[PDB]
Design a protein around this nucleic acid. Structure first.
Ligand SMILES: [Zn+2]
Ligand SMILES: [Zn+2]
Length: 45
DNA sequence: GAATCCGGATTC
DNA sequence: GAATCCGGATTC
């Protein structure tokens, strides 16, 4: 089953997409803002 | 349908 | 082998 964000790390607590990282910039990506990506979810599923 | 986890293809 | 581009799939 797919994991949920931890909700507590600094990226999880950011309120908005940064608007300028690769994920916020690239027009075809479905990846979350790099500044928001949950630290826990960076571990391999 | 939006958000975005997740993993395949490319490219190095 | 792995970072990056990319988009299928789930969960709401
Ligand atoms: Zn961003
Ligand atoms: Zn988190």
């Amino acid at each position: 089953k797919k994991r949920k964000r931890c909700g507590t790390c600094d990226p999880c607590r950011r309120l908005e997409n940064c608007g300028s990282c690769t994920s916020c910039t690239n027009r075809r990506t479905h990846q979350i803002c790099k500044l928001r990506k949950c630290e826990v979810l960076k571990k391999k599923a």
